[PDB]
Amino acid sequence: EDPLYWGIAAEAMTGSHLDEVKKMVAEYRKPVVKLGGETLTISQVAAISARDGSGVTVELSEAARAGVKASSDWVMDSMNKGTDSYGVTTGFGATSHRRTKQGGALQKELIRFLNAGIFGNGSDNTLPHSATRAAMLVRINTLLQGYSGIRFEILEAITKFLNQNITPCLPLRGTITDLVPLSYIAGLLTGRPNSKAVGPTGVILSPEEAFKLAGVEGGFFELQPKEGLALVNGTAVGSGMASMVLFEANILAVLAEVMSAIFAEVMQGKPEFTDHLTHKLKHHPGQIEAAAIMEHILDGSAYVKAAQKLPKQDRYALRTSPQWLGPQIEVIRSSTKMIEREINSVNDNPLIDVSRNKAIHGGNFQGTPIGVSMDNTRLAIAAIGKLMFAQFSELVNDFYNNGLPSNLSGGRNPSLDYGFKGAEIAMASYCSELQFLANPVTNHVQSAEQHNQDVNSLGLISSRKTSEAVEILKLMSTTFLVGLCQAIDLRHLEENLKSTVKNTVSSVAKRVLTHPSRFCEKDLLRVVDREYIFAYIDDPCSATYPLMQKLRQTLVEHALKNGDNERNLSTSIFQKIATFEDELKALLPKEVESARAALESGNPAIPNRIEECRSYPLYKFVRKELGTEYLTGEKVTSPGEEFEKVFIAMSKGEIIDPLLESLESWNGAPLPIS
Amino acid sequence: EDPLYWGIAAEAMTGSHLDEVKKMVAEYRKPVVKLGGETLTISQVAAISARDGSGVTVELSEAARAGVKASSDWVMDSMNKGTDSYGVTTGFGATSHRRTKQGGALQKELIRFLNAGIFGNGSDNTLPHSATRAAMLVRINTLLQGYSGIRFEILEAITKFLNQNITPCLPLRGTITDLVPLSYIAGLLTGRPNSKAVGPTGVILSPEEAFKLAGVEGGFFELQPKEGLALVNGTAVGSGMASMVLFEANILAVLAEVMSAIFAEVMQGKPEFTDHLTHKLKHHPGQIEAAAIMEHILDGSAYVKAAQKLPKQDRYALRTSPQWLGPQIEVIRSSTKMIEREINSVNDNPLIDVSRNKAIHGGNFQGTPIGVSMDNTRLAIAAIGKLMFAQFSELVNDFYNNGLPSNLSGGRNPSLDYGFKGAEIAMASYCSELQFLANPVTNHVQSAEQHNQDVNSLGLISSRKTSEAVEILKLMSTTFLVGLCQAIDLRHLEENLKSTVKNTVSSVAKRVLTHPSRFCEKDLLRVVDREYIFAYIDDPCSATYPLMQKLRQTLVEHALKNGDNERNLSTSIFQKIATFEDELKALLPKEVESARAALESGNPAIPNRIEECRSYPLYKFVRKELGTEYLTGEKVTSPGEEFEKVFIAMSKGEIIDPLLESLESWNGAPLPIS
Numbered sequence A, B: 001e002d003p004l005y006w007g008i009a010a011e012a013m014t015g016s017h018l019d020e021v022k023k024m025v026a027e028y029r030k031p032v033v034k035l036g037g038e039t040l041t042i043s044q045v046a047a048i049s050a051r052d053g054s055g056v057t058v059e060l061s062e063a064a065r066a067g068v069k070a071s072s073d074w075v076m077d078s079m080n081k082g083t084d085s086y087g088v089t090t091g092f093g094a095t096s097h098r099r100t101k102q103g104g105a106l107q108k109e110l111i112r113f114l115n116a117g118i119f120g121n122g123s124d125n126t127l128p129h130s131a132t133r134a135a136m137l138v139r140i141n142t143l144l145q146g147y148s149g150i151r152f153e154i155l156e157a158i159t160k161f162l163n164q165n166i167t168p169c170l171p172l173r174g175t176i177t178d179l180v181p182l183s184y185i186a187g188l189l190t191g192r193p194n195s196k197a198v199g200p201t202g203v204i205l206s207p208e209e210a211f212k213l214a215g216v217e218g219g220f221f222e223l224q225p226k227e228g229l230a231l232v233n234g235t236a237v238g239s240g241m242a243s244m245v246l247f248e249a250n251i252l253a254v255l256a257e258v259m260s261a262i263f264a265e266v267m268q269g270k271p272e273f274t275d276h277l278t279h280k281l282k283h284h285p286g287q288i289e290a291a292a293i294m295e296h297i298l299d300g301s302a303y304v305k306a307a308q309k310l311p312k313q314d315r316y317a318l319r320t321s322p323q324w325l326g327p328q329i330e331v332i333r334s335s336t337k338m339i340e341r342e343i344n345s346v347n348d349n350p351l352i353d354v355s356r357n358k359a360i361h362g363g364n365f366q367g368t369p370i371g372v373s374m375d376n377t378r379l380a381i382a383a384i385g386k387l388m389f390a391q392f393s394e395l396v397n398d399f400y401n402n403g404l405p406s407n408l409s410g411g412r413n414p415s416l417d418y419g420f421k422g423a424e425i426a427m428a429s430y431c432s433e434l435q436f437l438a439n440p441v442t443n444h445v446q447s448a449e450q451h452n453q454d455v456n457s458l459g460l461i462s463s464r465k466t467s468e469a470v471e472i473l474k475l476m477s478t479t480f481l482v483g484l485c486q487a488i489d490l491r492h493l494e495e496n497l498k499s500t501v502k503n504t505v506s507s508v509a510k511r512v513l514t515h516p517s518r519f520c521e522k523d524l525l526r527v528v529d530r531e532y533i534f535a536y537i538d539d540p541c542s543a544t545y546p547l548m549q550k551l552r553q554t555l556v557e558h559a560l561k562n563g564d565n566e567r568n569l570s571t572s573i574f575q576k577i578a579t580f581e582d583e584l585k586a587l588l589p590k591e592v593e594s595a596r597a598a599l600e601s602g603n604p605a606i607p608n609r610i611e612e613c614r615s616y617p618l619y620k621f622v623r624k625e626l627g628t629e630y631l632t633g634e635k636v637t638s639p640g641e642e643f644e645k646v647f648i649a650m651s652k653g654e655i656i657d658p659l660l661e662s663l664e665s666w667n668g669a670p671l672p673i674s
């Protein structure tokens, strides 16, 4: 039926990406990660990788013990029968013609010469301790399947190091994917003299102190034949970090879908761009899901529903966002499956097949799935950030943001409030560096190790660059999300002040215009209805702003059509202009300032419509739970001070819950075509 | 004084880039290229490379004959003394341990196994015949210095092939820089059975036919010891093409400087951005020259001088263009010097030093100067095109082009004329592909030829990508230059129609406004002076366009300040509005149409100010000599039809003369700081 396992691979790509993310989040928060060599998820690797006191613990399946012992015993019995085994009685790699009977000394030597990394002083050349934990977890998962020929006791010791947050120090570079950095795990286990570890609070430990604080009894391990090679001959570091990167990339792809919808909300975009017919007719599932998610947010938007009771299309960053995000999500999802197979693979060599009484030589250490998926994922991250840069740019440009202030300036005086202009330049710098990062790593392969390794994956180098790309995407997402919340509040200010202007224009009209000028009150209010508040509200009665000009234009046009009644000063509309303009100038500025002051005090005449929006949890989280403040030149607070709050919260995973809550009433299908 | 030749290298970088270009152009057009191994310029290589009947001929310096014979004789005498010489009695490259006494068969075999390229059918895998000519010229120049040990007769035969435009067919790929493609020159010379050549009209020739049409007498050459290796062991193909690319890149850099100034002219930019103080204070000579060149054009601009007799700063694509272009010009100039040294180098191995009675083994075949200069030059080409894309985008956007029509639309009805919108999308596609091409080639080095060639330059691959970049820059320059000429004509239309509107508004004012409304004629004309013609001229009396609205606003504001005189209908300014508006509506549309029709017939009321501009030669060349037409929706002609004229002319070098003429009165210094 499925002898090459294509079909079981296809099965994992069914169901929505969002449900996959919901499962990942639930898996991440489980208190125990039980390893049995076969069920490791990127969410479990991400959970173990954290060094933030979540309390997650690792436990080893007792079901693997028998297979582990069988291959360990097999190798030891092979050593005693005098047989010639690669990596056991022979040299390594291109020098495998050398032979020896000192199996123990051979493995000791293996770790010694693989300790060829460089740390220097400080931490710049050190693998992040979170990544080292991920690699430890993943190495255990490989060795547990019973094909590697290493004692279960060593796996238990690595488990204690994880559960006590005692982490060996690994070099950042030195691997083409992972012998050298993995040798620094083995060196801790053998107590090498240069081996160092870091405790939970950051203190450097000797191997002795580390064993002590981890509760590993029995002294340092003396590696038995093949045991050094089983520890080092795998892709655990590259795939470990790729899991951490993919966990965050998946969640950020959902954040990008939702923020594209909040973007549409505050831009007053046409929700038609999410119509299921459009996306159904292209078949791409990423684009169909993306449209449906944004459709869900917009179908529960108080802005859209308000507009319904009262340019045919938007620019690409809004209208084509489902077409744009769709394929990036498919890449991230497909890359995730590839990494999940890699972290559950037997990446080791040779393999001990006790059932056939032999060792199988092969290339499962070749981390191509990591290189390929990380290269492809990094390009997709860059495409997500380029869209986010385009959206941000639209949002802060008054040419394109449908009446929002230039720069999303917040204060009363636009000459002393340039809003997000600095943040916008920084968004360009983020986006540019992201497009550089989008270049591949895996097309830079050198013929290595005396040309024995004449192809090699560069997996971990690629994972490291995708991790950098993810951090930049977080800087962009933070900056965008705070911009969106500012725009939300500006729409709130806009609708309240617009009501005040309309009430004042009407009341002054009903006074000074009684004779036949009564007819033009409807036209004067229409001037207010159609004019952009932020084009004039900082100085509403200024003669050079559009409100006074167009009100006066309305009075003039009514007088010109007023006929012979215009010839009698008693019924002349033109003769009412200066009275009207004086009366409005006398009352409108204070009415506007009062309503604004009432809004700033929490007493708006019209409540903030975000509160009735499916997108409310993200706004509430940013503005109310984190206390991120509305940004104004009338205060000293910088945009960066507020970015910090969201960025630190995003990096602690606190965005996940409000992100998912905005979608929790979605049934996973697009709306009927209406 | 200068024992490492840094100082003589520094000397070549003095004087202006423009004077260097002027010399290059004069050198290109000389009727004879005399090679003596030491004076080859990129302009001579470009001139020889052409297959367009310019009649340029190659002649060999008789002064080199003695050195050539001496090393040829030396090698033959070495062969007869039984001595062991690399490439003469030994195998090649990584297999140099093999030995033989059949020197002739060794060189025959060398050409045979180096004929390892692939052509297929058609021309896609064939080196362009212009590049093959460049490589032939450059190979002669290396061998003429007397260090290679090859007969002068063979150089004379290649000279005949050049002077009769008989060109051997070379494969496009196969070289890491140039044994394989150079072996197809040697194969023609030895009459190999697969060897093919192309005549002047394109007919494929056998080696026999080629020798016949070239007038090479004496039959095919039988290579003597070392002669095959001297033919193939050089960088001639990479450096040959790099010369052709650099010749055009230098001229296009001057076109970019000048077009940046014409851009400023039609944008009504502030010529202050070229002020010498600004650029002097940065020391960069490329930026100082660039500013001074643009300053020269602007100081002789009738637009600027007109504006003088009657926003403080421009956007970056205009204001920072000298800062942007400066370093690209320095890179192109420095790369040119590197290639000129390479095409005059003894790139061969081993070298025969008769003066010391020995062969010198070395690495002069290592084409790093080509790879490095082409990689650096390609990045600079991309930066020039990115600026040109930014400038074009500004020019066709009515938000930023200071009153020019959106899309530079040309016709009477903007709803049926979308101008350069298609060209603008194509400019984005050019710019994007250019930014891709900007990636380096020389960071993709493979350890080659059984790891004997474990570093290699990839020079020719880089030259090929820079050549592609140059072609794209030509597509952008063509499209930009035709856009600039359209804008020039639109400023001509703008000033003529604006005069017509002002005359009509004045004459109707002086009639229907005589009572005290005489005072507002000055304000009404000011409305015309300050309003953008193209914001209303397609329908000048439309009530929704700014002209009628603001004229009416002027009459209303004068009536409001007219006081008690406004209360008597005899002296009421408001009572004059509908008369004025009716009178203007009756006369202005036909006055405008008449003046426009008079302009289209060559009878403008105001001549085209381009005629008094230092930039006039480029406009005259494009619009009048090439017959490139003003683009309008009222005709069937496409922008591409007009692009063709300029692109084909640009590729024939016909842009050079008008380009240089626009600068011919420049003394090479910036203006005094005033």
Ligand SMILES: C=C(c1ccccc1)[C@@H](N)P(=O)(O)O
Binding pocket: A092, A093, A094, A179, A233, A349, A350, A365, A452
């Ligand atoms: C080449 C290898 C190696 C190199 C250095 C030390 C230990 C092993 C192993 N990847 P293998 O291909 O399994 O022999």
Ligand SMILES: C=C(c1ccccc1)[C@@H](N)P(=O)(O)O
Binding pocket: B092, B093, B094, B179, B233, B349, B350, B365, B452
């Ligand atoms: C390695 C070389 C070679 C390879 C194939 C054919 C002929 C020569 C020469 N570049 P060289 O380094 O001069 O020996």
